[PDB]
Structure 1
Amino acid sequence: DTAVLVLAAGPGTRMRSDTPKVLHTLAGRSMLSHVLHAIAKLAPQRLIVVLGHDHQRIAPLVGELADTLGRTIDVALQDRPLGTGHAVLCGLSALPDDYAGNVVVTSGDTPLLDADTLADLIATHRAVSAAVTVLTTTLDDPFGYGRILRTQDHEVMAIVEQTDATPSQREIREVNAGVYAFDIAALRSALSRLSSNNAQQELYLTDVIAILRSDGQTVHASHVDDSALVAGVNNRVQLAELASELNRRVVAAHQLAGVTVVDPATTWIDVDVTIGRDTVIHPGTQLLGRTQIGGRCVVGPDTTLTDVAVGDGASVVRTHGSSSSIGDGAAVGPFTYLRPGTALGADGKLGAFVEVKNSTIGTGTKVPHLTYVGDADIGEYSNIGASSVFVNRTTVGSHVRTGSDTMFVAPVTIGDGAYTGAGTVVREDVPPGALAVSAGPQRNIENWVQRKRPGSPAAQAS
């Protein structure tokens, strides 16, 4: 029986943001959402998020997150940010007075923490019969962390905050993860003895460690060797670094599973993205939101895809796209823009300097050059000539061949197997197998250049 508290009621002033700290994203989820996803998988009996000033904005998200995860998450309010010890007290209030289970506390800014590390904590806690067990780690750069103070016999004495530490303390590299397990009575008891006479004038949760030692209670430090699993984010430097570490882990799982990633340093893949066996990812690529790539694809350099479904054997090169689907063996790019609701059939082609929006394009149909396709539906095995525009609903059939420089003025229907000559403004329906035209005939004006640009380099008409 376990209750988990997530402290998320801090101001987050070190982020320098009008967006609440806990809502800043990495790999496609807010920090808060990474933290709640980890804990949901542990399924504690109770789950409590402490909110503060920003509560009106954060509480709804947490609401949505609880439906997604199919459990109840309670919200407890901390009206002023009096410190992490004060934040725990606020959390406990949403538990019954007689609650007997263990209490786990973690922060809203520790976004790589995972169900495993959580479960190892709880087991260690029950195993050693600890009143408090605290996760620790060691780091080349311990700045801004609580430091772990041990006695001569390796006993944990206390945790000392960065602001409160001696210059000699501070050199300590074993750090506080800010993830704890407590016996609830021991914990209620220690919180009442907290005073705020320290460098920041706050009620520090970390002071509970020395307080329980006073009472001769058992204090256990549980070292986590993978430091990143418990790294915190307090500013945008630490956010980006953890984003970068998380992204390497995600790239690696995909490589181990059969994806070639030429350049992981410049390949960003969100947490929910799937990729098929033997696809190749070239440098400078972001695969974002719920993007899915099938097998044996080529995802070319300099491509950004957000919520795009790409089938097997497709090629997607220097393309910027969202909410769109691209079929098996289709060719997209280079220099192509897909806007939401684009659906490209299997073996379709969207080519260089082509933009598509809210349009359906059938099997094997090609839109290869310099064209805009908006609010249109196109059949199968059709060819849309270069430098054309769908001027926004237009229906084009199958096996159609439209000529370069055609403007399709919505709404207009072009029948199966119809043609359009180069330079046509289509304003009326075109029967199947008709040719539609509008351009006047060529006239050559002889010796225009001698007459109207005399002495120019072009009077090499001589």
Structure 2
Amino acid sequence: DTAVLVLAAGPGTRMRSDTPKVLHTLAGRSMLSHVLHAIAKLAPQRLIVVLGHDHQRIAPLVGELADTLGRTIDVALQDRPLGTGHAVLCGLSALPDDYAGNVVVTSGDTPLLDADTLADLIATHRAVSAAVTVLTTTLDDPFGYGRILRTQDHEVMAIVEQTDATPSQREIREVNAGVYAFDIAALRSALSRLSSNNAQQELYLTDVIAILRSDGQTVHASHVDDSALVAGVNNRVQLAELASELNRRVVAAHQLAGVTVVDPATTWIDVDVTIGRDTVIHPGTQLLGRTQIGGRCVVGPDTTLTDVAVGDGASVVRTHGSSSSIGDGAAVGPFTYLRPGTALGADGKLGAFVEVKNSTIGTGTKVPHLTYVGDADIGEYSNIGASSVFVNYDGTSKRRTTVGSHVRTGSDTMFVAPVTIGDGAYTGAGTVVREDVPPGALAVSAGPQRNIENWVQRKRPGSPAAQAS
């Protein structure tokens, strides 16, 4: 029986942001969302989020996650800038006064923390019958972390905060994770005893370690060797460094599952993205949101896809796209812009300097060059000529165009919506299509060529003129 408290009440002033700190994102989720996903997997009996600074902007998102995760998540409000020890006191208020389960506490800015680490914490805590178990780790740069203070017999005595540590204490590289399990009675007693004699004048939760030690209570540290799992974020530098570590691990899981990632350092992959076996991802690529890539694809370089579905054997190169689907064996790129609602069929092709928006494009159809396709349905095995525009917009309103199958439209055709081009139709180079075109018809509008001989000697005497001569 366990209640988990997430301390998320701090203003995060060190972030220098108007967006609440625990709402900043890495790998496609907020820090608070990462932490709550980890805890929901653990499935504790109670789950309490302590909010404070900006709680009105954050509490609605907690409600949304609770629904997403199918569990209730209680919010307790902290109403004074009085420290993490006070944040826990506020969290305990959302429990019955006679609650008797363990109390696990973690901060909302420890975004890599995982269900396995929390399960091991609770198991260790129960096993040693501790009044408090604290997670620690050891770091090359421990700046801003509480330092773990140990006796000669290597027994934990205290945690001293960065701003309160002597210069020698600062050299201590073993740090507090700020993740703990508590016997609830011992915890309640130690919190009433905290005072604020420290550089912040706050009630530090970390002081409960020395308080419990002094009461002859069992105090256990558990060393997490994989430091990233308990690393915190107090500023944008730390955020980007954990985002990078998280990203290296996401990429590694895909590489172990059969995805060639040429350059993990420049390949950003959000946590929900799936990628099929033998896909190759080239450098400078970000796969974001709920993107799904099939097997044997080629993606990148310099591609960004957000919520894009790509089938098997497709290539998607130097492409910026969102909310779109690319069928099996399709070729997209290089230099292609996909806007929401784009659906390209299997074996289709969207080539260089092409943009598509809210259009359906059939099996085997190709739009290879310098073209805008907006609000259009195109059939199968058609070919749209270079430098064409689906003119959806008449200055005030937008309309659909329908192009059939096996069509071959000429370069520099304008399709002035609404118009329909029937199956197997053609248009000439340079055509402005304003009326329906029957199946098997050729539609044209360009006037005839006239050559004006010796124009250049007459109007440009000197340069093309010489050489004409």
**Aligned twin of 2:407:** 400
How many residues end up aligned between the 2 structures?
462
Match of 2:29?
29
Q: Deviations over 1:414-445 (max 9, x none)?
A: 00011000000000000111111111000000
Query: C-alpha displacement at 1:152, in angstroms?
Result: 1.4
Shift of 1:460: 1.1
Q: How far apart, CA to CA, are the structure 1 residues paired with 2:464 and 2:65?
A: 71
Alpha-carbon distance in 2 for matches of 1:80, 1:361: 58
Cα distance in 1 between the residues matched to 2:155 and 2:313? 59
Query: Take 2:4 and 2:462, find their aligned partners in 1: how far apart are those partners?
Result: 87
SS in 2 for 1:44: coil
1:80 Cα deviation (Å)?
2.0
Is this contact kept in 2: 1:449–1:459, CA < 8 A? Answer: no
C-alpha displacement of 1:197: 1.1
Assess if the C-alpha contact under 8 Å between 1:335 and 1:352 holds in 2.
yes
Shift of 1:154: 1.0
| Counterpart-to-counterpart distance in 1, 2:294 and 2:329 | 10
Q: Distance in 1 between matches of 2:144 and 2:419?
A: 65
Shift of 1:24: 0.4
- Is the 2:121–2:133 contact (alpha carbons within 8 Å) kept by the matching residues of 1? yes
Q: C-alpha deviations, 1:303-361, integer Å up to 9, x for none?
A: 00000000000000000000000000000000000000000000000000000000000
After superposing on structure 2, the runs of 4+ consecutive aligned residues of structure 1 that deviate more than 4 Å are none
Does the CA-based 8 Å contact 1:289-1:307 persist in structure 2? yes
Q: CA 1:66 to 1:285, structure 2 compared with 1: closer, same or farther past 3 Å? A: same
Whether the 8 Å CA contact 1:453–1:459 is kept in 2: the answer is no
In the aligned structure 2, how far is the partner of 1:276 from the partner of 1:11?
Answer: 41
CA deviations on 1:106-158 (whole Å, 9 max, x unpaired) are 00000000000000000000000000000000111111000000111111110
Can you list the C-alpha shifts for 1:239-263, whole angstroms capped at 9, x where unaligned? 0000000000010010001000110
Partners of 1:354 and 1:232 lie apart in 2 by 43
Matched residue SS, 1:249: helix
Distance 1:44 1:420 in 2: 66
Secondary structure at the counterpart of residue 170 of structure 1: helix
TM-score, normalising length: structure 2: 0.98
1:79 and 2:86 matched = no
CA apart distance, 1:190: 0.3
Return the offset for 1:300: 2.2
- Determine if contact 1:408/1:425 at 8 Å carries over to the other structure: yes
1:81–1:87 contact (8 Å) kept in structure 2: no
Specify the SS of the correspondent of 2:202: coil
Deviations 1:195-239 (A, max 9, x none): 111111111000000111111000000000000000000000000
Tell me the SS of whatever aligns to 1:439.
Answer: coil
Question: SS of 2:206's equivalent?
Answer: helix
How many Å apart are 1:81 and its aligned residue?
2.0
Hey, what's the Cα distance between the residues in 2 that align with 1:352 and 1:266? 23
Compute the displacement of 1:160 (Å).
0.2
Structure 2 CA distance for aligned equivalents of residues 300 and 128 of structure 1: 52
Hey, what does 2:325 align to over in structure 1? 325
* Residue 458 of structure 1: how far off its partner (Å): 3.6
Structure 1, unpaired ranges of 5+: none
Q: Is the 8 A contact 1:53 1:80 kept in 2?
A: no
Give the C-alpha shift of residue 105 in structure 1: 0.1
SS in 1 for 2:169: coil
- Partner SS, residue 216 of structure 2: coil
**Does the CA-based 8 Å contact 2:337-2:354 persist in structure 1?**
yes
Residue 270 (structure 1) shift: 0.4
Residues in 2 aligned to 1:70 and 1:8: alpha-carbon distance in whole angstroms: 21
List gaps (5 residues or longer) in structure 2. 393-399
Q: Deviations over 1:171-190 (max 9, x none)?
A: 11110000000000000000
Which shows bigger deviation, 451-460 or 16-25? 451-460
Query: Contact 2:131 / 2:186 at 8 angstroms: preserved in 1?
Result: yes
Question: How far is 1:76 from its partner?
Answer: 0.4
Distance 1:330 1:458 in 2: 48
SS at match of 1:459: helix
Partner residue, 2:172: 172
Q: Whole-Å Cα distance in 2 between the matches of residues 119 and 61 of structure 1?
A: 25
Q: Are 1:28 and 1:270, in contact at CA under 8 Å, matched by a contact in 2?
A: yes
Determine the C-alpha separation between the residues in 2 that align with 1:363 and 1:34. Answer: 39
The answer as to whether partners of 2:284 and 2:302 remain within 8 angstroms in 1 is: yes
SS at match of 2:94: coil
Q: Deviations over 1:391-410 (max 9, x none)?
A: 01000000000000000000
Q: What percentage of aligned pairs have identical amino acids? A: 100
- d(CA) in 2 for partners of 1:214, 1:137: 23
User: In structure 2, what is the equivalent of residue 125 of structure 1?
Assistant: 125
Shift of 1:364: 0.2
Distance 1:226 1:85 in 2: 26
Aligned-pair CA distance for 1:298? 0.4
CA distance in 2, matches of 1:338, 1:157: 59
Counterpart-to-counterpart distance in 1, 2:321 and 2:98: 54
The 8 Å contact of residues 7 and 50 in structure 1, kept in 2 or not, is answered as yes
Query: How many angstroms does 1:293 deviate by?
Result: 0.3
SS of the residue corresponding to residue 5 of structure 2 reads strand
Question: Paired residue for 2:163?
Answer: 163
CA shift for structure 1 position 43 = 0.1
- How far does residue 456 in structure 1 lie from its aligned partner after superposition? 2.7
Measured in 2, the distance between the counterparts of 1:53 and 1:181 equals 25
Question: In 1, are the aligned partners of 2:375 and 2:401 still within 8 Å (CA)?
Answer: yes
Question: Cα deviations across residues 361-383 of structure 1 (Å, max 9, x unaligned)?
Answer: 00000000000000000000000
Q: CA deviation at 1:53?
A: 2.2
2:456–2:464: 8 Å Cα contact kept in structure 1?
A: no
Residue of structure 1 in register with 2:366 after alignment: 366
CA separation in 2, counterparts of 1:57 and 1:253? 34
Q: Distance in 2 between matches of 1:341 and 1:47?
A: 39
* Partner SS state of residue 466, structure 2: coil
The aligned residue for residue 198 of structure 1 is 198
Alignment of 1:139-158 (within 5 A): 139-158=139-158
Q: In structure 2, what is the Cα distance between the partners aligned to 1:61 and 1:327?
A: 35
CA distance in 1, matches of 2:264, 2:14: 30
